[PDB]
Structures are given as structure tokens and as C-alpha cells.
Design a protein around this ligand. Structure first.
Ligand SMILES: *[C@@H]1O[C@H](CO)[C@@H](O[C@@H]2O[C@H](CO)[C@@H](O[C@@H]3O[C@H](CO)[C@@H](O)[C@H](O)[C@@H]3O)[C@H](O)[C@H]2NC(C)=O)[C@H](O)[C@H]1NC(C)=O
Ligand SMILES: *[C@@H]1O[C@H](CO)[C@@H](O)[C@H](O)[C@H]1NC(C)=O
Ligand SMILES: *[C@@H]1O[C@H](CO)[C@@H](O)[C@H](O)[C@H]1NC(C)=O
Ligand SMILES: *[C@@H]1O[C@H](CO)[C@@H](O)[C@H](O)[C@H]1NC(C)=O
Ligand SMILES: *[C@@H]1O[C@H](CO)[C@@H](O)[C@H](O)[C@H]1NC(C)=O
Lengths: 458, 104, 457, 103
């Protein structure tokens, strides 16, 4: 018995599915018999539910009630819904979590209350939903963390309070809900949090504080051992303090960009054995290379716009498993070995005060593919410096003070860049440089030596 | 243009959604098309932003439906779901699985 | 009567040319045809000239004696030379300019004494060479400017002391030689010059001090009004002082790159109406934009790697007819009009602290082709900002924290880069954006809106 | 490889010259060739450097042979020669042109 206007189908065995989606109903359907296993009412102008709700369909897995602009759910509305598993109450115009519509609804796992105009969450509204694992409370007008009602949600594993207007997170704001694995608080107005907010969830693995207004680094992060992912970008932090992520080993990825970060601790990024990625742009007060003990499996390290002086002798010892390095736009004069730091694939050291290239400084980089040393003060190259880099294909020494050019090894690449090097005038052959297709030269006369009088810009 | 859609191109379908809805993409033969949904179909998860709300493909191994990323809401059969993730074992901290596939 | 093995030919009317190059004589030929109007012996192991000279040929315009092994030229050797105009004595192993040998050779106009090992020039060696206009004296082992022997050379117009080992330019070191137009002192080791060295030559137009060891800015340049080109690059100068080029208007080109420059005066670049080009990168100590009044015909201005705070409003008033502008990698926050300064074709203001772009900040730039504002802190775009730029074809707004995007004007360009702007999430359509060939996107899904032409997610 | 030449490619010609000789370029059908000469031919001028000495074309208006850039040593007929430059006139401070061609 499919209701009028609607679309029906058998679920698994003989249970029935009623689709009453965008049909623009006035009220929910009458009739609509038992055997019904999930029910969709979306975008259909439902003011009040109802003069006659419809409980007693004891087999209903799922009600979807999104886009219906109701203002308030009376209590007994969901009583007979004994097998309710997922209830959706999205983009409706609720102003508060149903004071009592939502309780002792035993078997429900996911409750979706986003895109409403909810502002206050009543205490013990969530009394007796010991199965709720998924909760939406985003795109709403919350003002604080509803600590009260949240306790009874100890089965909660994933929650989102994104896109609200919460500004402060009190201590123990999430006391009991230790089952929580995913917490989402982005696009809010979070300025300050307590020293002991996050101490509740011992099973939290992901955290989202992105697009918010915090001024200082959240030190409450320290207590979340199991945390794997963390994001606090597009905020207003000034600096990462020493031993910031000490309390969170087994962190994989971190997000903090578009934040006016100025100082980063030396040891701030120590002991994160599985950390894979890094990018640090524009940290001026950084005068030191950061310590990376116990963090040896990074693959991409880039540190720019600072005032580093030079690198420690054995710098790369802490750093295997990486492939890309970018230490551009700093005050680098002397250069380390780079030898041990194998498997390197791409390097960028432009705009440094490097006056020289020693022999070993790029020795035995069998994986190195790209080397950029443009805009430096490189007066002199020891000839065998490049003797040992087969995998090298693109090379730049632009805007330098070079007079001659080394020759050993090297032979066989794709890019070679040499402007600003006016002291370079002598020729170079197509032979001992085949497969070269894109080229720059200080003077036009040497470019045609490669047949342009393939690309080559004088 | 379409029901609950603000901007429509004859090439792309829906480009933008009515205030509080979700855009659904599909790349068909190196062509993408957009439709607007009050919520997403299975296999994705619902992501809101003040710029765009989009139904996003769930980048998880052996997962049918999800909440956000790195958290699965329902896993695929023969595989069990432990705290949003999916495994055949599932510790040994002390979990164990009932007549369904939902270890505690 | 052409000498054996050489190849002869008649010049103009009946004159004879004897070419005896690349043959390795022991000595010059004995029986020579006079009638000879120019004569070349190059690369031929000529030790001594000689036991038997051959003057009295009154007419050779030109003797070429390069690449040969002489050590000292005797006095009477070139006497009968009533018509010598150009004598070249290069690639030789000379230790000093011939004492007297090169004296009163009337018609001599160009003298090539380079590629030797001369360190000493006798005073009045160049006595009576009143037709000498050109002098080579490079790649020799000189130690000082030999001012004495130089005075009598008041007809000299072109000279080269490049690549020697002179260290200091004495006071008045070039006293009378006011006829001099080109001076060459490059690839040398000049550490110091006098306050009044260059005041001699009133006709100098070019000066070469490139590749030298100057520590301080040469203030002696001030007296040189007629100077047009100047090069002092690859030295060890630290700063350009205020009113540096005050004394040399009608300067067209200036060269000072590869110099550890830190500070430049504000008014240092005033009044040089014909200057076309300048590039000054890594000048940290400058905190202000330089003044450019009476100098409005710049076509290429680029200023990066400094610490200026902002641009004065009326910047473009001094600055029409420019085409390329580059103030990247610095501390720019607010932006002036840029309207007044039309004819602009290329702009680059990347790596500045620009948090905003106004409506007027780019109004009316029809010659503009490419505008780069990457790596700034620009939170917001006023939509009509780009309403008025037909010719715009290349744009970069990467790593800039935008949320939205205007669409106003512009439509139909060739390059668009907007990565690093994660708060951009809404799509952007293929229509109202044709001719788009290379594109970057913060995210893959909007790349696809263009049929993926190139597009990197 | 060639007279006073140390390094030779059959495709580019001479690539380098003996210590104190000038390398000469010439564009033969969008292929370049290097040759070695004790001095440059007219239309050039001799430019020395500690790295390399090269024969350089005189990028000038109406001149046959020169010393360097912007300064001509010999101009072509019908035009007057003044202080390395060439004009049909030639001022007005006190120059004047006699039976020859050197105002
Ligand atoms: C801290 O979190 C726990 C975990 O949810 C909160 O819930 C639990 O409270 C209930 C009482 O409402 C206890 O369950 C009881 O047991 C029988 C079945 O054994 C049940 O039929 C009763 O109706 C009753 O629900 C349960 O022991 C307790 N769980 C734990 C782990 O303590 C607790 O209320 C939260 N409170 C605070 C102050 O942290
Ligand atoms: C929804 O239905 C009610 C009838 O109770 C009507 O008054 C209201 O205007 C409808 N809303 C919309 C948005 O159509
Ligand atoms: C050179 O000239 C002399 C006369 O002055 C003559 O006796 C002699 O045979 C000539 N030798 C040659 C090789 O022409
Ligand atoms: C070079 O000149 C010497 C005299 O200085 C002479 O003995 C020798 O034969 C000459 N060698 C050649 C190859 O001309
Ligand atoms: C050259 O210098 C001498 C002495 O330094 C001076 O008397 C003379 O006027 C100057 N000019 C000429 C043309 O001699």
C-alpha cells in the first residue's frame, strides 16, 4: 500500500520504502501503513507535525524531515518510532533542540540537526539516546558549548559544531563523551579556551579549529594522545611555543596556514614519528633550524621567509625519507653535505647569500631531479660538485656571479638557467649537452649555439 | 534553471545552490554536471561552508557511507567498523562483535 | 713587385697592398715593392726589426705587426713613415711602450698597443702624435695612470686601459685630453680615485669602471656633464649617496649590478631626463620610494627586496610612459591610484603585505597585459576593480586568502592562477572565460569546469 | 682543429681561441660558426676579456668600422664624422669640414 502521489519499493525482504520527497505536501501522508522501513519527506512545506502524527510503524529505520520549515517538534511526535536508526531534521527553522521530542529513542545512531536557527540546547534533551554516534549541529546560531546535554552522549563518536557563533570553550566542555573520535568546530568565533577543555575525550583522533579567532596556541591540545589530525588554520596565532605537539605523538598531518605565525620553537616539531608533511612560510623571527628528533619520516620540508644563518653539520642525519627541500628566501651562506640526505628529488635554495658551492655539498643524490640555486652570490663552483647527480634534469644558477662552468658528470638533462651571470661569456656546445630543450642565456650569441638565432631566451 | 538552483549553465548544469542546499557533482566522460540536493546520496558526506555546500566523495577504503572524512558511518561487508575505521580483526583493547558487525 | 708567397692587390689608384699574414716569416721580405699603401704581417715570428729597415715607402696607411715576437722597437724604425695612419702592435711581448720610436709619426690616427706585457710607458713617448684619435692599452701589466706621457695626447678621443693592474686614479690623471669621448678602465683593480681625477676631459660621454675593486661611490663622476653611459658594476660598493648623478644630466644608461648595494638615496636619481632603464634588487636599507622628478621617461622600473612602507599618492605624476613595474618581495600594504600612470604593460607586486585592493587602484590601465598580486594578504576584492582593463590577458592571485571572485569586466583572458586561496570554493564557468589555456586551481573540482588547455589542482 | 684554435665542433666551428686571439662569430644560415683572427675585420671591433676576447658587430647608424659601441672609427660616405658619431651636419661650436671627412 504505497500512499498517493508517492514512490514505493520493497526494502530488503518485503519491508516497504515510501518516498514522498519534493511533492510539496501540506501535511505528512495519512494512511501510510505498517511494514514501512524508511521514510523521506524533504522540501515539502510541513508546518506542524501533526494533528495526526504516525507512530506504530515499528519497523521504520529512517525518517528524513529536512527542508520542511517546522518551528518546533512536540514531544510525543516520535514515540512509536521504536526502530528509528537515523533521523534527519536539517535546514528546518528550529530555534532550539527539541526540549523533549528527542529522548529514550533507543536505537538511533545518527541525528542530524544542522542548518537550523538553533541557539540554545536544553539540558537533558539528549537524555537516553545511548546509541547516538553521529550528530550534526552546524550552520546554526549556538553561542556556547552545551556541556550539560552533551554528557549523556557517551556513545557519540563523531560530532560537528561548525558554522555557529561559539566564542569560548570552557573546561570539561566535553567531559564524558570519551567515545568521540571526530570533533568539528570550524567556521566559528573561537577566541579563547580553557587550559582543561579537551581533557574529556580520550579517543579523539581528529580536531577542527580552522577559520576561527584564537590569539594564542591552544595548549589544551597536549592531553589528546590519540590525536592524529589537527587543523587550526585561518586564525590569529602569532607563534608555536616550544614542545607544542609533545603531548600528541602519532600526529599525521597538521593545518595552520594563513595564520600570522612569526616564531616557531626550535624543538616545537620534535617527536612526531609519522609526520609526513611540512610548510612554514614567512616566519621572520626564526633564526634557527628547527630540531627534528624522532621525526625522521618527513617527505616534504620547506622553511621560508626567515632569517636562518646557516645549517648544522649533520643536519640531514635527522632527515631521511624526505624528497623535497625548500629553504628559499633566507640568509644561507655556508652549505652542509646533503650527502646522507639521499632520495632527495627536488631542492630549492634561491635568494640566499650563498657565495660558493663545495664538492660534496650535493654529493651522491642519486634521486635528485631538480636543483635551483638562482639569485645567490655564487662566485665559484668546484668542478666535480655535479659529477655525481645522474637523476638531475633541471638546473638553475640564474642571477649569480659565475665566470666559468663545470662539465664533469651532468651530461644529459632538460633545463639549464644562467642569467645575471654576466661574467659568463664563453661558449657551450650542443654536444656534451644534448636533450636540452629549454634554455636561458645571458647573451643572444651563445643561444644559437643550440640552434636558436627547443627554446632559448637571451 | 532547476528547482532550488540559483545559477545554471547549459554546459555545467547547476553552478550554485539555494541558500541551505548541497551541490552534487559528477564527472561524466571528462565532463562534470551539477545538481542541488537537500542532502547527499550514499557514498559521500555532507560538508557545509558559507561559500559553498558540497556533497563530497568519501575518500575511505572499503566504506559505503561516512560522516566526515577518516570516519566511516557504514563499512562494506566482510569488513568490520571500529570507531569510524574498517578492519577484519578489531583489537584486543577489548571490542568483540555481536550478531551484527558492530564491535564494542 | 709583390713578395714571394704573399698575395698582393692594387688598392685604390695604383697603390699596392701586400698581405703577408699567417706565413711565419723569419724576417720581413728583403726586396719590397714600395707603392705600398697598407701592409700586414700578423702571427709570423718576427724577432727583431731589424738589421735592415724599409722606410722610404712614404705611403702605407696601415702597418699591421700583431702576434709577432718583438721585444723592443728601435727609434728610427718608423721614420720614413710619412703616411702611417694606423699601426697595430698587438699580441706582442713588449715590456714598455717604445721610448721614442712612436714619436712624430704625423698621420697616425689609431695605435694598438694591447696584448703585450707593458708596465712602463716613458713620458713623451707619445710626443708629436697630433692625429692619434684611438689608443689601445689593455691586457698589459700597468700599475698606475701614466698622466705625464698622456698630456700631449690632446687629440685622443677613444682609449682603453681595461684589464691591467692599476689601483688608483690620481688627481687630474687625464689632464688636457679633453677630446677624449670613450674611457675604458674595466676588469681592473681600482680601489681608490681622487676627488678631482676626471675633471680633465670635458668631452667624455662613456666611462667604464666595471669589474673593479671600488669600495666607495666615485664622486669624481660629478664633473662629467656630457657623460651618457656609465658602468661600475661588479665592484664592492655598498651605497649610492644623495645627489649622485646630479652632475651628469643626459645620462642614458647606468650599470651597477653585482654590487653589494644596501642603501640608495631618495633624491639620488634626480634630473636625468633621458634615462630609460634601472634595476635595483636587494637594497635592504632603503625604507622610502625614490624621487624621480625631471626624470619621467623611464620605461622599466623594478624595485624589490627592500623595506619600504608604502608609495606616496602622487607617484605616477612623475611617472608616465612606463610599461613595466615591479615592486615585489617587499612591504607594501596600501596601494595608490596607478590610474595616472598609463601605458603600463606589466606589473608585479607579489610578496607584499597588501591586505586589500581598491576600486581605483587599477582603473584605466588599457596597455596592461599581466598583473601579479600573488603571495599577499588580500582579504577582499572590490568587484569593479577590474572593470576597466581590456588588454589584461595574464593574472596571478595565488596564496592570497580570497573567498569570492569578481567577474566584472575582464572576461576572455589567457592565464589565471588562484591556488593557495582555499577560501575560494565556489566554481567558475567556462563561458564568460574563453581563451583560457593555462590555469591553476586550489581544488580539483573547479578545474573540471574547464573540461579536464591546462589546469593543475 | 684550426689555426690558433684549441676546441672544435664540426657543427659550431671553433668554440675557443688560443690565449690572446679573438673569436669570430658569423651567422651562416641560422647556424653559427667560430673562427680565430688576430684582429677583427672591418664592421667589427675588438673586445678583450679575461674570460674571452670576441669580435663584435658595430650596431651603429651609417658606419663601416668602429672602436666600440656608439663610437665609429670610420663612417660611410656622404655623412660627416663627429666624436665617434655620424651626421650630415655637425655643429656650431666650431667644427667645419675640410677637403676630407672629419669635422
Ligand atoms: C559519564 O558517562 C557515562 C557513560 O554513558 C554515563 O552513563 C551511565 O549512566 C547510566 C545511568 O543513567 C548507567 O547505566 C545504568 O545501568 C543499567 C544497565 O546496566 C541501565 O538499565 C540503567 O537504566 C542505567 O542506565 C551507567 O552505569 C553509566 N555509565 C558509565 C560508564 O558510568 C554517566 O551518567 C556519565 N556521568 C558522569 C557524571 O560522568
Ligand atoms: C508552506 O505551507 C504553509 C501552509 O501552512 C503556507 O502558509 C506557507 O506559505 C508555505 N511556505 C512556502 C515557503 O511555500
Ligand atoms: C733583391 O734585390 C737585390 C738588389 O737590391 C738583388 O740583387 C737580389 O737578387 C734580389 N733578390 C730577390 C730574391 O729578389
Ligand atoms: C721563431 O723565431 C726564432 C728566433 O727568435 C727562430 O730561431 C725560429 O726558427 C722561429 N720558429 C718558427 C717556427 O718560425
Ligand atoms: C694641456 O696641459 C698643459 C699643462 O698641464 C696646459 O698648459 C695646456 O693649456 C693644456 N691644453 C693644451 C691644449 O695644451
Amino acid at each position: 500500500g504505497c500512499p498517493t502521489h508517492c514512490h514505493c519499493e520493497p526494502d530488503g525482504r518485503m519491508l516497504l520504502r515510501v518516498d514522498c520527497s519534493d511533492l510539496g505536501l501540506s501535511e505528512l501522508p495519512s494512511n501510510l501503513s505498517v511494514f514501512t522501513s524508511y521514510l523521506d519527506l524533504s522540501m515539502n512545506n510541513i508546518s506542524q507535525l501533526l494533528p495526526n502524527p504516525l507512530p506504530s510503524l515499528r519497523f521504520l529505520e529512517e525518517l528524513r524531515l529536512a527542508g520542511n520549515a517546522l518551528t518546533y517538534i512536540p514531544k510525543g511526535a516520535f514515540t512509536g518510532l521504536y526502530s528509528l536508526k537515523v533521523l534527519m531534521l536539517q535546514n528546518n527553522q528550529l530555534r532550539h533542540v527539541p526540549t523533549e521530542a528527542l529522548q529514550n529513542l533507543r536505537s538511533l545512531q545518527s541525528l542530524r540537526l544542522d542548518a537550523n536557527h538553533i541557539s540554545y540546547v536544553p539540558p537533558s534533551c539528549f537524555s537516553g539516546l545511548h546509541s547516538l554516534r553521529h550528530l550534526w549541529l552546524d550552520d546554526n546560531a549556538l553561542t556556547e558549548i552545551p556541556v550539560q546535554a552533551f554528557r549523556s552522549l557517551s556513545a557519540l563518536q563523531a560530532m560537528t559544531l561548525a558554522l555557529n557563533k561559539i566564542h569560548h570553550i570552557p573546561d570539561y566542555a566535553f567531559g564524558n563523551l570519551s567515545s568521540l573520535v571526530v570533533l568539528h568546530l570550524h567556521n566559528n568565533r573561537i577566541h579563547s579556551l580553557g587550559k582543561k577543555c579537551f581533557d574529556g575525550l580520550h579517543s579523539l583522533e581528529t580536531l577542527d579549529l580552522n577559520y576561527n579567532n584564537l590569539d594564542e596556541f591552544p595548549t589544551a591540545i597536549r592531553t589528546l594522545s590519540n590525536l592524529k589530525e589537527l587543523g587550526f588554520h585561518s586564525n590569529n596565532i602569532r607563534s608555536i611555543p616550544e614542545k607544542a605537539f609533545v603531548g600528541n605523538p602519532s600526529l599525521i598531518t597538521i593545518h595552520f596556514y594563513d595564520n600570522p605565525i612569526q616564531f616557531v620553537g626550535r624543538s616545537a616539531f620534535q617527536h612526531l614519528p609519522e609526520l609526513r608533511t611540512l610548510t612554514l612560510n614567512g616566519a621572520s623571527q626564526i633564526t634557527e633550524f628547527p630540531d627534528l628528533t624522532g621525526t625522521a619520516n618527513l617527505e616534504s620540508l620547506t622553511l621560508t621567509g626567515a632569517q636562518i644563518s646557516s645549517l648544522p653539520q649533520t643536519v640531514c642525519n635527522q632527515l631521511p625519507n624526505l624528497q623535497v627541500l625548500d629553504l628559499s628566501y633566507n640568509l644561507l651562506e655556508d652549505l652542509p653535505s646533503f650527502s646522507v640526505c639521499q632520495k632527495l628529488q627536488k631542492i630549492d635554495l634561491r635568494h640566499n647569500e650563498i657565495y660558493e658551492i663545495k664538492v660534496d655539498t650535493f654529493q651522491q643524490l642519486l634521486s635528485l631531479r631538480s636543483l635551483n640555486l638562482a639569485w645567490n652570490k655564487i662566485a665559484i663552483i668546484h668542478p666535480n660538485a655535479f659529477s655525481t647527480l645522474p637523476s638531475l634534469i633541471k638546473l638553475d644558477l640564474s642571477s649569480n656571479l659565475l665566470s666559468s662552468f663545470p662539465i664533469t658528470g651532468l651530461h644529459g638533462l632538460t633545463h639549464l638557467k644562467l642569467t645575471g651571470n654576466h661574467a659568463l661569456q664563453s661558449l657551450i656546445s650542443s654536444e656534451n649537452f644534448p636533450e636540452l630543450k629549454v634554455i636561458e642565456m645571458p647573451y643572444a650569441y651563445q643561444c644559437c649555439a643550440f640552434g636558436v638565432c627547443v627554446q632559448c631566451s637571451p | 534553471c532547476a528547482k532550488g538552483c540559483e545559477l545554471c549553465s547549459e554546459v555545467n548544469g547547476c553552478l550554485k545552490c539555494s541558500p541551505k542546499l548541497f551541490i552534487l557533482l559528477e564527472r561524466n566522460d571528462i565532463r562534470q554536471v551539477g545538481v542541488c540536493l537537500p542532502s547527499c546520496p550514499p557514498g559521500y558526506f555532507d560538508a557545509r561552508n558559507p561559500d559553498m555546500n558540497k556533497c563530497i566523495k568519501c575518500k575511505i577504503e572499503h566504506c559505503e557511507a561516512c560522516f566526515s572524512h577518516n570516519f566511516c558511518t557504514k563499512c562494506k561487508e566482510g569488513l568490520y567498523l571500529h570507531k569510524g575505521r574498517c578492519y577484519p580483526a578489531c583489537p584486543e583493547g577489548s571490542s568483540a562483535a555481536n550478531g551484527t558487525m558492530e564491535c564494542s
